[PDB]
Each structure stands twice: as structure tokens, then as C-alpha cells.
Amino acid sequence: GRLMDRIRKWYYNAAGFNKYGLMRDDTLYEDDDVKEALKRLPEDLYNERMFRIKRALDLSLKHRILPKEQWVKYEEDKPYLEPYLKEVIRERLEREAWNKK
Amino acid sequence: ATYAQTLQNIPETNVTTLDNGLRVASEESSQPTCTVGVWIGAGSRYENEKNNGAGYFVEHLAFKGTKKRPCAAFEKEVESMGAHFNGYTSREQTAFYIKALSKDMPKVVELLADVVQNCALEESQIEKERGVILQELKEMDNDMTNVTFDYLHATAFQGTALARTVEGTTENIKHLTRADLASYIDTHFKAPRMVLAAAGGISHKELVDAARQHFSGVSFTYKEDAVPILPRCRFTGSEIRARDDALPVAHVALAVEGPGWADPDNVVLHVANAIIGRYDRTFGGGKHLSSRLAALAVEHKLCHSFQTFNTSYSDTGLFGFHFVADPLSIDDMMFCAQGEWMRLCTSTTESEVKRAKNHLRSAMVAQLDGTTPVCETIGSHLLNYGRRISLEEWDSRISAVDARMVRDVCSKYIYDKCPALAAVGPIEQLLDYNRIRSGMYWI
Amino acid sequence: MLSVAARSXXXXXXXXXXXXXXPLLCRESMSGRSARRDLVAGISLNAPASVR
Amino acid sequence: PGAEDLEITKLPNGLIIASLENFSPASRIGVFIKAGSRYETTANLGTAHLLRLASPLTTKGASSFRITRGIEAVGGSLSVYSTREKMTYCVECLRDHVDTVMEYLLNVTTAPEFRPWEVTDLQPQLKVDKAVAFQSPQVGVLENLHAAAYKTALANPLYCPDYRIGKITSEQLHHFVQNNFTSARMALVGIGVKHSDLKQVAEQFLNIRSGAGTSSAKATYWGGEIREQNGHSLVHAAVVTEGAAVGSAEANAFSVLQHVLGAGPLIKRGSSVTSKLYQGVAKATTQPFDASAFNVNYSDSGLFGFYTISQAAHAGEVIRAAMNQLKAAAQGGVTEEDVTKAKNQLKATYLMSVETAQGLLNEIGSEALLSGTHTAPSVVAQKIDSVTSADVVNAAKKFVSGKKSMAASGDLGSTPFLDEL
């Protein structure tokens, strides 16, 4: 429903990672699927992500955040990793199911 | 057309025995070309301490012409008719075969017979092959895989006939006599111990006719028609480690005693080996290969290659595996390998066997791709199983194998046994027989 | 005979060293080793690398 | 039954479909294609080689995983053989699983995805694959031979050059497959299956539109001389001249001049007598060696000459001797009988070379692609003996007169230069 979609944008703002300049995907815990997914990222997307994270960590150490202007906006958050992650998980399930078979 | 049927349409193998005892067998096809040759039950196992290598020294002269026609003549006559003459000599089997047009079939037989019976053994030639053989020993000495299997045999069957190399010793080659070679041929190349095999577009009747013609000499006594049973070779759980850190990679070969041609278990064993399979760094399958050991080998870079083997003999055999790996990964490879062996005795799945059988089926069919390989099969089958075993029969045997069976058969030959080990090269990281021995139990 | 060869389960592998790279001593262990014709190259997902 | 037929349709788009049926318990299907290192340019060298190794990568229909576990599941196999101008993707299996194994062959040759990461992880393999092949000196000199013999297309190496390892892109692969794997350049041969089925498969599936996309820039003879001093005690050397082209009229002549000079031993450890070249060499040298007639037939060109192997010091005598034997033949030195021996020696070789399911399929395929139909085994034999004692002697002259190109390897301190012959 286009209602809970209001909820989403709410949560997104409540979470607050955008205040560090992080994209939703930059906050994913690096389990195994994510580890693999990242290895498949194009050089540029990978380095962009790297700087964003090193930037947040520097903010976090400083106990500061980004000026309101620079915060990532809900509709401008690039889910760059989700496509790859989605695939890494498909492949794994395939193998898993095939090995029980 | 179904696989089931195609197996039946395969033309039967006609076999007929002569008087002298020689056997004649063939599989007729529509082919214009063909192969015929004689498969003799004689090799290094039949040799002794002082004549070790005769069968090989002979194999070298078997082509330098007969008495009926000297060297240049013999060769010219074979070449000029576009026929290929080749052969070999193992531990329990020798063979000389020819590849030519179905037409020449009869002239071929005449030649085969002239070689196995009238080899000239010219003495000037013998002094030449002496250097030739010595040279091949130095060349073969640089083939680790063979140096390794000879060592495996040398120790697995230490103190017996099977412990000898086919090429023989340096001393023997340097001193073998025109006599010894003659004596070997006379003593070993005999009718009841031979089989004339032919595959291609040839008429059995036509073939057997030619045989009677050039395979003359009949026997008088009862000893001449007696096929001697060889003294059994004792297996020994032991190891030989030839160390040279100056070599690039290490070779390791480990094995347990096999049953021997006759035993039906050999079928299961081959199915087993099919599960573990083989591998080498140019297999495109890579990390996805179905063989667990190949997979790990890729994941952890355990080896340059590995292979399983079920080398059968009349009364014994060697069931093991061989791998080549860098000095610093020998341990893990051996570890993972013995692991897979224990998995065989304890947890093989019906999934693994289903595939193993399919791999083994394709494999047996592949051994019948051409006339030479079909001829080789006939020659050996008669010589080892005393008849021919069709693809239709084999397949039946193979279809009978199931997980349960593989487990029981492997447990029977592998579990808690004292293996034979041969290691060559920079082998420091692989160690202690005791540790290898403990790898023979507990999944 | 338009075959590139007839003019231009099994199989054994091998292994070498990289970085920089990765015996025949009689007319016997050399004969038949003089380029029959062109050069073919094979690769299998299940077997050794071939070359003629 | 058994005494069957060899059908050979040719669909709308230009895709050829040759089929047979010897009721063999196992089937073998291939996909021959006019594509090789001959269609590469300084810009995408090696891409053909990588494409060969890339066969197991994920396709739009099956994953890198399912392709291997899938084919192995049915005891099947899958390989890719390729020359400098033809690629063959073939699979093998039991009759019951042809259908199964087929899905992957289709996917591999028409629907690759060449995912960047898969491609990237794969490239270092070119390094290995090449390293094993180059173990035989035989292969090293043939690379340099073609190089010195040409200026383009065929001059291209069969194994990806070192400098390009790791620099090939998913792009280059895609484009290379789009511009060369086009229906009018492909043939779907297949031994051991009814022609009606192999046909049904082709139609209902195969895409990558017809045409002939990229065209190979006609090979231009150069006649160079490349020498590789590497210390080896055994010198390999090849000296050739431009020869016959595939299916050429002049072709069969060299094939015979080949066997007349000696084209590979027939008796284990024997000294070929029917080999003038060998016998001629043996009279000149005294140490171990080998020498043969070298012959290659390419689409728009060919190579012919001899290839030797010898101890470094007796390299001179061996190659000069191998030469005189070519001149002495270009001077009527060919008996009417030598021509007769060779003639059968060749029909036999050709004939035997087709007992192998691989050899057969490779025959039925090579024609069904470069031609459009299957020649009769009697026509080939008829065309071969229709070669005159003159045809042979003239071929020999074409060699002595034509501009030569050479390629050596090993300790060349006693090896001669092309202009000292």
C-alpha cells in the first residue's frame, strides 16, 4: 500500500544514517552474501562506497554529523548493492537445493 | 532408438579355438579399415632376477624383421601398404597389433605370425638396441609419474615378481644374450598363451582360415598345452620415500591390495573411483566439479592434479590414488584424500552412485571408440576373463551397484588396512607412515 | 578431407610453474614429433588440455 | 539395422544441420563455427582464446554451477577445440541424455553473459593454460612460424599474448561473439541421433541472427624468419612456403608430396624407408633426430615445408639435408611408384582417422561448414589418386621457387639462416 510507503520514508528518517551521508546499503552488516556481493561491485561504485564509510567513521570519531544540506534524501538513496546481493543469494539457494537433491 | 537397444544391436564377438590352442576372436563392423594383433599373456611378472627385461628387449627387436624377410624388407612391406605397426609390453601382458585396410587382413596375419614366431634377433641389431634401451631408461627416469608407480609396485609387492619394472635393470640390459632373448620368445610366446584379435570390417571365418594357415606348429606333449599358473605375489603395507628437494613438485601414490580381474567387486571399486574421480588444473569445471576432492583441491589449491586407479592383475591388484602437488600442500591434500576414502566406506549417498554409474558407463563405451581400442578389449578380455564381456553385460553389473554396496565393498578393501606408499620429490611436509595409517579409519 | 585435422571420461593432465616458466635422447623418443600440420587447441570442463 | 544415411538440411537463416545415426550407445553433438584468432586485431588479441576458456561461465539459461553439475550428473562431457579459424563446441553422453546435455550446449554457444567478475576471476587461467601447452616446443615454433609467414589474420597467435592477459573485457567477448557466432557461419553436426530431432532443436531455439558480421582481412604472405635462442639441447625448426588452400585443386598434390617425403612414422621405433626426407637426413647426420613433411590448409592460404628436431651441433647438416631432399624431388626425383605408395598411405591415414567418433564428427562437420554437403569417401579417394607424378614434382618446385619463411628454437649456434639455404 502507498501508506506504509509513508512509513518507510518515516523510518528512513528516524534511522538517521543519512546524517552521516551513508546510503542504506552502506549500512549492511557484512555477512557472507554481502561479502561476495561487494566483490562484484564495479570499481567506481566500490570506491564511492569506501569513501562514504571512511567519512562516516571520521564523523563518528569526531562526534559530529553532516550539515543538514548534505544528508542523503529518502528518494535519492541509491540501492546500488541490492541487485548483486539478490543474485548472490539466488545462486547460493540454487546450489543448496541442488546439493540436497 | 534407446541406449537399451543400441547395446543389443552390437555385433557379437566370435571366438574359435585352433588345435595348437591359440584362440581367434573378432568383432565385425561395417568399417573399411581395421586392426588385428596378437595379445600374449607374458610380461615382467614372468621374468626372473637375471632375465628381467627380456620381454622388453624383445619388444624392440620384434620389428627389426624376421628370418623370412630382413629389416629393410619387412619395414618397406608394412609401410608401402599404409599399415601401422605398433605394440607394447606390461607386467602381465604383451601385444603386437597392426592397423590397416580390411583388405590386407590376411597378409597382416601372415606378418603378425612371422614376428611372434620368426623374429630374426640379428646380433648386430641387439648391440644397437642395447644403447637405445639404455637411453629410454634415462628418459623415462625423468617421468615422475612412472618413477612413482614403479616405486609403488617395488614396495607394495616387495620381494616378488610384481616388484620389478617392465624395462628391467641396467645390468640386465647390458648383459642379456641373443640366447636369453631367444629363450624368452620360445618359452613364452606360445599358442595357448596367445590370442589373435581383430576388429573392423573382417570375416571371422576368413580370419580363422588365415590363422590355421600361418599359425602352424602343433604340440605333442601335455606340457606344451599347459598354461602355467604363476606363484602368488605377497602384498606389504609399507613405504618408499625418494626425496629430492631440487624437484619442482611432489608425487605421492598410495594404495591397498586389489582383488584381481576375476572378482565382481572390481565393478563396484570402479564405481567408487568414479565418485572420487580425477582432476587437473585445466578442468574448466573448477570449483563446481561434482567430485568433492576436486572441489577442495580447487578451493584450497591442494594439487596440480590427482587420479584414482584400480589396476587389476590375474590374482592381485592395486587400488589407490596419485597426486602431484607443491611441497607445501602435500599434507592437506593427503588429508583430504584419505578423508574421501573414509567417506566411501561410511557415508556414500545414492546420489553420488547414480552419477558414478553414468560416468562409468560413458567410460566403458569410450574404451570402444575405434578398432584398435576394441581389439585391445577383446585381446585382454579373453586373456583375463577367458571370454568377452559385452557392454550389455557390463552395464547390467553396473546398474546393480548401489550406495549400500559401495560402502560394503570399499570397507572390505580399504578400512583399517595397511597401505603401500610411494613418495618422490620435495616430500618433507608429508610424513610418518603411522600418521598415514591412522588416516585409514574413522570417517 | 576438408578436416583441419585430416591434413594438419579419459585424458591425462599436467602442471608447471609460472612467473617465468614451468626428455628426448634417441631417434625413437622423438619420431612423430615434427608438427604433422596446423595446431589445434582444446579445453574441456571435465578433462585435460589438448594441443596438436 | 545400421546401414543408415547422412541427412543434411540447411534452414532459412543459413544455419546448416548435418546428422547421422550409427546406433552407437553414445551420442556426440557439436557446434562448428567459422571464428578464431584470425578475426582478432591488435586491439582485441587473445579474446578468442579467453572465449575458449569461458565456456563454463554463466549463461542466460543456466548458471556456471548448473552447467557443470548438470553435465556431470549424466556422465556427460563438454569441450571446446579450436584452430586459428574454426571453433567447435561439442558435448558427449549416453543416448538417453542427449536432450539434457543439449540445453547447455545451446546456452553456452548462443547465450553467454560474460559477467565482469566471472570474466575477471577467469583471466589468470590464460596464464596457466598457456604454460602447459608451451611445454611442447612443437607449439612454440608453430606460433612464431605463422608469425613470420604472415602479416595478418593467420599471423595471429593461437594463445593469448602475455601483455593482454587480464586486459580483455566482457565487451570484447560480447562483440566477438556477436560478430562471429552468426547462423550463416555456424553448423550443428551430430553423430548418434535421428536427423529429425537435431533439426527440431536448431529451429525452435538458436538465435544470434544470420549474416557473417566481421570478415577476416585476407591473409598476406610475409616470408619472415623468427629465431628463438633459448639454450635447449634440441633444436626444432620449420621452413615453409605458401601452399594449397582448403578444398583447393592444388591441395591433394602437397598431401601426396607430403607422404612421398615422409609424414610421420608407421612402425614403432622403426626407421621409415618410404620416407625420402628421413632416409635422406639419416644419411647426412649420425645422432638422434626426426624430420617430416609439414602441411597446413587454411581458408585463403596454406603452408608447406618440413619440420626438424636435432642435437644443436648437427642442426646444420640436418636442415640442409632436409632441403636437398626437397630439391631432388623438384627435379623428377619422384618415381611413379612413390606416388602410388603415398596415394594409399594417405587414403589409409584418412580412413583410419575416422574410426574415432571425434574424428568422424570432425569430418562430417568440417565439410558441412566450409562446403554445404558431404563428399563421398570414394570421391575423396578418386580425387586423391587422380594426382599425377607431375602434380607432385611441380608442388615440389613451388616450394623451391617460392619465398620461404622459417622459425627455429633451441641453441641455434649452428642453425642456419633462411638465406644460407
Swiss-Prot record, chain C:
Output the superkingdom of the source species.
Eukaryota
Q: How does it assemble?
A: Component of the ubiquinol-cytochrome c oxidoreductase (cytochrome b-c1 complex, complex III, CIII). Subunit 9 corresponds to the mitochondrial targeting sequence (MTS) of Rieske protein UQCRFS1. It is retained after processing and incorporated inside complex III, where it remains bound to the complex and localizes between the 2 core subunits UQCRC1/QCR1 and UQCRC2/QCR2.
What the protein does?
Component of the ubiquinol-cytochrome c oxidoreductase (cytochrome b-c1 complex, complex III, CIII). UQCRFS1 undergoes proteolytic processing once it is incorporated in the complex III dimer. One of the fragments, called subunit 9, corresponds to its mitochondrial targeting sequence (MTS). The proteolytic processing is necessary for the correct insertion of UQCRFS1 in the complex III dimer, but the persistence of UQCRFS1-derived fragments may prevent newly imported UQCRFS1 to be processed and assembled into complex III and is detrimental for the complex III structure and function.
Report the protein name in the record.
Cytochrome b-c1 complex subunit 9
Q: Which organism is it from?
A: Gallus gallus
**Gene responsible for this protein:** UQCRFS1
